[PDB]
Amino acid sequence: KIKNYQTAPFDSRFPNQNQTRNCWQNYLDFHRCEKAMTAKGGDVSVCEWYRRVYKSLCPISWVSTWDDRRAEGTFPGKI
Amino acid sequence: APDFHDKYGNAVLASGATFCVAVWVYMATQIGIEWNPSPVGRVTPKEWR
Amino acid sequence: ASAAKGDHGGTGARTWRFLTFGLALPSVALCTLNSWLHSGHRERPAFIPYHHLRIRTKPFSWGDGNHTFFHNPRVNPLPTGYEK
Amino acid sequence: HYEEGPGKNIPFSVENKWRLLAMMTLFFGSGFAAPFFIVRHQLLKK
Amino acid sequence: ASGGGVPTDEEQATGLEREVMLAARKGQDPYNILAPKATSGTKEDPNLVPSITNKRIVGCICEEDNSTVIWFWLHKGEAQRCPSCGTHYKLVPHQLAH
Amino acid sequence: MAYPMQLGFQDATSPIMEELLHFHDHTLMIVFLISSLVLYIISLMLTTKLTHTSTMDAQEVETIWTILPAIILILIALPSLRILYMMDEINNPSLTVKTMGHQWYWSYEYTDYEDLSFDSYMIPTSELKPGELRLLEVDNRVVLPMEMTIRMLVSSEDVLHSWAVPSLGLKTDAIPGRLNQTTLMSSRPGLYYGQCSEICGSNHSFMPIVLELVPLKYFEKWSASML
Amino acid sequence: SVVKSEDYALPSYVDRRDYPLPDVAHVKNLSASQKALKEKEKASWSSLSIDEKVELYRLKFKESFAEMNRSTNEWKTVVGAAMFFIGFTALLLIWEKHYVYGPIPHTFEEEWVAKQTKRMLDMKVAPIQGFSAKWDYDKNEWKK
Amino acid sequence: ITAKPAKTPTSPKEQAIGLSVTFLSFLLPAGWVLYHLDNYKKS
Amino acid sequence: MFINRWLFSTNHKDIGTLYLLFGAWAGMVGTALSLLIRAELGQPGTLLGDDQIYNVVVTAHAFVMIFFMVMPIMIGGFGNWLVPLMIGAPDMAFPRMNNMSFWLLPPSFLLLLASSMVEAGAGTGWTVYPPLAGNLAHAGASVDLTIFSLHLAGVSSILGAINFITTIINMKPPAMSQYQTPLFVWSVMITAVLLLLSLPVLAAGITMLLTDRNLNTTFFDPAGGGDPILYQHLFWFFGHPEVYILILPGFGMISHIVTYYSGKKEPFGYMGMVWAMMSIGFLGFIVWAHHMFTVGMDVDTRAYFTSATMIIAIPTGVKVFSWLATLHGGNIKWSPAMMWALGFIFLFTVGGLTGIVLANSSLDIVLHDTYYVVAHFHYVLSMGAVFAIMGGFVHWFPLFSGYTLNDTWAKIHFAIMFVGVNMTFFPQHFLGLSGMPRRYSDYPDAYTMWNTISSMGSFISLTAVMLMVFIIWEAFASKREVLTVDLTTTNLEWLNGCPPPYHTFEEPTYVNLK
Amino acid sequence: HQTHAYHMVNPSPWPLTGALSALLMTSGLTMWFHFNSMTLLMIGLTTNMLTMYQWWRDVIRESTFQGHHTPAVQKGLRYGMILFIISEVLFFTGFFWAFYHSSLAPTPELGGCWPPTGIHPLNPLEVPLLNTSVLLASGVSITWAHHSLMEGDRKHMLQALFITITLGVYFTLLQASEYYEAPFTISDGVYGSTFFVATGFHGLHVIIGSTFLIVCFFRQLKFHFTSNHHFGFEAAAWYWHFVDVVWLFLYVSIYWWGS
Amino acid sequence: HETDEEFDARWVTYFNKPDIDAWELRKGMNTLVGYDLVPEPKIIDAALRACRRLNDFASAVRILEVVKDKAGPHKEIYPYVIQELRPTLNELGISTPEELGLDKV
Amino acid sequence: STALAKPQMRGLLARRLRFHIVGAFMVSLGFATFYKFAVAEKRKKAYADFYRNYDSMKDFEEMRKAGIFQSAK
Amino acid sequence: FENRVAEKQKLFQEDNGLPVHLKGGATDNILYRVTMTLCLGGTLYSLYCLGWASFPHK
Ligand code: HEA
Ligand code: HEA
Ligand SMILES: CCCCC/C=C\C/C=C\C/C=C\C/C=C\CCCC(=O)O[C@H](COC(=O)CCCCCCCCCCCCCCCCC)COP(=O)(O)OCCN
Ligand SMILES: CCCCCC/C=C\CCCCCCCCCC(=O)O[C@H](COC(=O)CCCCCCCCCCCCCCC)COP(=O)(O)OC[C@@H](O)CO
Ligand SMILES: CCCCCCCCCCO[C@@H]1O[C@H](CO)[C@@H](O[C@H]2O[C@H](CO)[C@@H](O)[C@H](O)[C@H]2O)[C@H](O)[C@H]1O
Ligand code: CUA
Ligand SMILES: [Cu+2]
Ligand SMILES: [Mg+2]
Ligand code: NA
Ligand code: NA
Ligand SMILES: [Zn+2]
């Protein structure tokens, strides 16, 4: 729909200096979407926007820790 | 009757001022203190690369 | 509100005794029955080694360092799970 | 009772000025010295 | 719903507490709980200042609601005047078992 | 960077820092004026043998003493808050860069497109090359495109730090578990320095920040070469 | 006469230009001749001699206004002593530099500073006012 | 304030002694530590 | 007798004297720590070691100067000596609990000394922020000893506050309303209210830090859902009131000193001074996040804390102008205590105005955690609290001791200190504007000149401190006994003579109501 | 001889033994936390109890036995107790602040939700409701005790005070049982931290308040109180109502709203 | 408030009270010099005659000193006031501080 | 001889204060004009002049040729 | 129980010069000595523990 992605756009849900929840929300939305799409046999390519946003915003170590915990079964957010 | 200040005030003022100036000038100029003043108008720039 | 009771006239021990035995202790007895009724152990949930729980940044100053102060083996897992 | 009056309402003696000087030297001198000797202690450790 | 058994102050207060209680019943104030009411404070009608010794500090609030209090020793003898407003005070010494 | 014998702020590298300099000028004039007026009145009150020691009525002069300072405060607060809200307006960044504080160095992640990240350590004094600045140079600079709005996101992986660049008017604390955002825009190419600004242990004094601002095309090629 | 510590609750004498008539006389005990002078004071003051007037004054008061208000040389002592102890401070600083401080870093060496200064000009440190603004890049010299 | 003359006058010489002892009580112990810093560190 | 009098005291004057001796000894410790700071910074490079030993010294410097020098001297020392005398009371309300407030301080100080002796010290800043102060980055006993030192100092001052509030409300002459008590008494009452409300919150926060460090709580640890910034809120909810606690009794003494050496019977604008101290005390509880403008706070919150912080300048300016108006028309007596007070007025005003600069959160982005803040607060603390302490000490030393100081020596002492503290701190404004961080053991070379001058200034203040000890020795050595004191009609604390008897006001004052 | 009504207290060793007991308890906690040893702490706890015992013993001697508590002295003690309670309110306020800060903005580590993922809160309608009725009931019975005392009724004062203490003990035993049964612990993140530190300090204050009520019970048995002079009882009742109100805030905030 | 004339008249009346006592003389002068003014000659005249009725020569001299002091640096005021008082000074035999040498430091 | 004229005798302190508070104020307006002109205006003009014809690419090329950059030779 | 407050009032008001904390008799002295001995001995022990903890241990 809209490539030439440069970086994550301003998001009125998260307008202040603390962007922690912006990273978290896009991480959740990406993996929630990917679970939905790979369940119903659809295409994860529709989840790509959320993936781009959380990759731009989230520290590598947060993503890595959250990915490890998803694999371990200890991720405390709902997906 | 003249008190301590009438008798000694001039001497104390004169010697205190002279001593203070002499020892701060000496400390400031003679013992290797690096004041690091501005290079502006003082330092000739020199090739570094 | 005003409760729904309704006395006054001047102040007294007899009134506060009436409230102690007529309202306060009956309520304790009722809540004691309500409780001694929903009591009896509850089935413990699967252990999941969540990293925000079972925190250990320094051993506890008692026991083996790994048991909380009022550790209950039935419902308090260790960082490695329930005790066997 | 207790002693009253100048030099008597204090926990230290001012009856002799040189003994006083020694006591005041020890008193203020020990407080001023202590941080230097703690620094020394921390440097000598590691 | 009837019993006693709790002592009263009349029965059981002791020491200074009892002294104050008994003096208050008489309308007396040997321990200075109340503020004295001023007289007109002229030399003919000076404020009378009780004391158990030969001098007592007076504080003079010269006018109502002045925040500044004027303090001075009042001595046995002829009435003295507040050094700010001039109102007169005279010491009346006594013994204390008044 | 600062220079020897400097009295005031580093020259502004960003428009917001420009604004802060003029607001500081507006405010320091008031500081000087009030402090000098108090010193002078101290001298007016203290330089006469004339006396007047009876009770003085206060309420008229206390009106002056409250209303005039209230007006002065409003004269400071109005441009102050204007800058605050302007600093907060939406700006649309072209680039996001993260920095993570550590004991004792900074790491940087540029993950809009590729997995680019590296560590950035103070150059030790014994390894400075001639003309380099003691305690300020780093081994890997934060290269960035000039004349573009950049979102910096700041966090920490251990204790508190704080990521500062005085010539851009930047200081954002680095707090573990938190992602703080600031914006950066340099009017000029060059090298802009800062230092860790929250006490963080043994080498707090020795984990500096160096931004290297260059044209976009140089930044793109540098980025590709850092993969 | 002789003021005692045990008199603190009694009205006392003070010389203050804002309290010209103190609460007591400076001298309360009178010799035979001073008693006779106080009696003479009840008659016309025109019949008192100058010395008798002065003696009455000095019975009532300790110092005159001119005496109690006089200026002193104390400032010389204060300013001079303060400068002495400030001077003494520089002795401590000299001691510290000789015995406590080691060499400063090699970046203060004259050649290092010359090269650093050029590198600062090459990166246009503070080019609007603070540093490079003061360099003439056209004439290769510090602006006049 | 007014006061009595000193009951135990402290002459200029006595003041110089008191001042000197006081200053040495602050300076000597700190001076000894700072003089020997290198010994403590480079240890 | 000695043990009964000085270890078992129930006497407000002797306990005041104990606090003054304690605070003076702490002052020497805090001075030595401040000279180690300035020796480290007095030339470029490393003198002592890296930032750990350096910030152990900085941390202890602040705790000693605040909790063991200023608060004990102003509140325990001058408050205990003067408040009961100024209201004609026979002692404090709780004379025996008063003695425990005193004796909790040597153990508190011992815990702080122990902190710096064990492991590598608590190199945290006096703010003790986690995670640096947590059990991973500051493993071992030092930070827990600091926490416990603060607990004991906190209990001491909370009980002291209860004592002062009760004494001042309950033990005045029955005709004296609160609006007939002297300004220093007001200043102690307000300070005590601030202590009562703020210290329990500190106690909560540092107890949370203690359990995070030792009981596996995670109040401030994100891994458990905690937040380091919560600690900062709890700490500064106390810490801003704390700086007004440090200065309010100073304001009270300055009012008395300026009135007295102006030859006035009363300060200008008494009810405005009361209003101003109450307003400062109240506003002092709603401004704390001006210590957090760089933590990542929302813009509207920054706008509020900017504005609330500035408004404190209005009642504060009423007090400055009312001191000027007290001087106006005075028969000015240029005593050494008057000089301390005049220096206070000017230096406090300088530091207040740099506070106003900092209140602008947009400029504070650049100034925060730099030496501009250090300059702001040393103008209000080392040239405000310290100058009010020295003014009150030389003014009331004859009352406490019965002996006079040598006024020429005391003026010399003032002159040296005034030069020393301004050479120390004025250049730190330049260092802060040009970007030198706080809590640094070493600095980029450009900062050398101002750090050199600042360190030289600190040595001039050392010489003043050594001279102060000698001056006190000279007074007790010569034994010039006080005779008469002017203006007792409006300075009740002098009216029982110098020193006053052990028991005063055994017979209370007579005050009628009219 | 004084002619004011205030109490000049005899020189006393208990301020010093109390201060030293604070040094021993804090250095003792340090030794326990870091040097595996309880010795200093047990000495400090012992000297603290001895100090409190003798200090408050002496206050009873000075008042009931020596008559030094004039109305003016009593009025000072009333202010002192109110101010002390105010400081304790502000102490709990810090823990309530921590609780709301963490629960109103739950971080990602928790699951970004409150209660955190993996936390199973107690049912507020079970033993926590029972505890609420117990403390509220004890506020009624202590008011009965107060009115009986003012009406000169020794027997009903003792009966009502005994009931109040029994309820305080019941609350403490119930809370101890709930602590043991709770499936979460103090190490269970900020949920367990806020829960146990806030309710635990509250439980400590219930034990303190119950001990104070028991002191009043034995003084009453020894006839110390008159129908008009009984400030130790009033202070213990004020402290007891404070403990009740803190519980009500904990119940609403942590047990109910936070569940 | 009151005119200058009313102020002055009140103070003349104060010192002119025939049986004014020593305490009232001192209270009057010590209060008067607190104001932002040098007292008019007619006030000083009444105070000096009060001194005379109280047989107190020294206080009359002291009152002249304090007039001079209240003028501060305005050196023209005291010689004018002495000029205006000379008939009274001559009538009562009051010597000035200068005539007594009491202006010497 | 001639009599001395009557001088002003009342309100000398108030008159002195009035005169000097106005002079105090006049300083501040006179200072404010100086500080605005010597500092604040000078700064606005220095920034406006600097950027008026500023060529950022040219600045960059000078820096690049001087060798100062890691990313650009 | 019987009201024996009057007996205790006589005891604690006896004109014997004793401070209130010792006026109950020899048991007060014992309890005072136990308390002060534990405090002072405990404080010396705390200093020893500081000295031990101030140095690293193998
Ligand atoms: C006695 C101590 C004291 C006092 C009184 C003050 C008073 C003030 N302080 Fe200060 N402050 C500290 C001690 C004090 N401070 C300390 C220790 C710190 C740092 C803590 C740390 O980080 O360790 C600090 C930190 C600090 C900061 C944080 C800076 C940072 O960390 O980035 C700020 C910013 O808001 C600030 C502002 C002010 C203000 C506005 C006042 C005002 O209350 C001043 C008001 C007074 C005046 C303004 C002067 C007189 C007024 C007039 C003559 C009238 C005319 C004036 C006007 C019209 C403006 N202070
Ligand atoms: C009252 C508080 C107080 C006082 C008086 C001082 C006094 C001094 N301080 Fe202090 N300082 C702090 C509180 C204070 N400081 C605080 C809170 C910090 C921040 C800590 C942190 O960052 O965490 C700090 C930080 C600080 C720093 C910054 C450290 C850094 O960021 O790395 C520096 C550096 O120069 C400094 C230097 C000095 C010096 C040279 C003095 C000298 O002026 C000292 C001179 C001596 C005196 C002023 C006299 C001492 C008083 C007496 C001797 C009592 C006499 C007793 C009687 C008369 C009864 N201080
Ligand atoms: C029944 C209620 C009363 C509790 C009695 C238990 C002893 C504690 C004494 C009371 C102190 C209260 C607050 C102390 C903080 C922690 C205690 C919290 C209450 C409690 O008892 O929490 C228990 C943990 O105790 C633990 O860690 C034990 C830790 C024990 C040592 C605490 C040491 C810390 C003391 C710090 C005090 C500082 C005070 C400063 C005062 C301020 C000065 C102004 C919970 O047990 P759990 O096994 O984790 O979960 C139960 C699972 N089945
Ligand atoms: C267990 C781990 C360590 C914790 C230690 C705490 C342990 C328990 C302590 C329980 C408190 C017991 C208090 C007993 C006080 C008895 C003395 C008393 O009650 O004294 C009364 C005065 O009140 C007074 O001092 C009022 C005195 C105020 C007492 C305040 C008590 C609360 C103290 C709490 C300590 C807080 C700890 C907080 C920790 C966060 C005496 O006057 P009356 O009663 O009028 O009698 C006079 C009449 O007889 C005359 O007719
Ligand atoms: C920050 C506050 C302190 C700053 C200012 C201190 C001023 C110093 C005063 C003198 O201090 C002494 O200086 C000596 C040297 O002058 C040292 O002797 C050392 O040096 C001598 C000469 O090398 C030897 O004789 C000695 O044995 C050796 O201890 C000595 O130990 C030290 O006490
Ligand atoms: Cu990282 Cu300071
Ligand atoms: Cu603040
Ligand atoms: Mg910071
Ligand atoms: Na250094
Ligand atoms: Na009651
Ligand atoms: Zn009066």
Residue numbers in the entry:
A (entry chain H): 7 to 85
B (entry chain K): 6 to 54
C (entry chain G): 1 to 84
D (entry chain L): 2 to 47
E (entry chain F): 1 to 98
F (entry chain B): 1 to 227
G (entry chain D): 4 to 147
H (entry chain M): 1 to 43
What did the original publication write about this model?
5 is the terminal oxidase of cellular respiration that reduces O2 to water, coupled with a proton-pumping process. These sites donate electrons to the O2 reduction site that comprises two high potential metal sites (heme a3 (Fea3) and CuB). The third proton-conducting pathway, the H-pathway, extends for proton pumping from the N-side surface to the P-side surface.
Complete saturation of the azide-binding metal sites is not attained by exposure of CcO to 20 mm azide for 2 days, whereas elongation of the exposure time up to 4 days does not significantly change the X-ray crystal structures. Thus, in contrast to the binding kinetics for the second (low affinity) azide-binding site in solution (faster than the time scale of minutes), 3 days of exposure at 4 °C is necessary for saturation of the two terminal azide-binding sites. The discrepancy is likely to be due to restriction of flexibility in the O2 transfer pathway induced by the crystal packing.
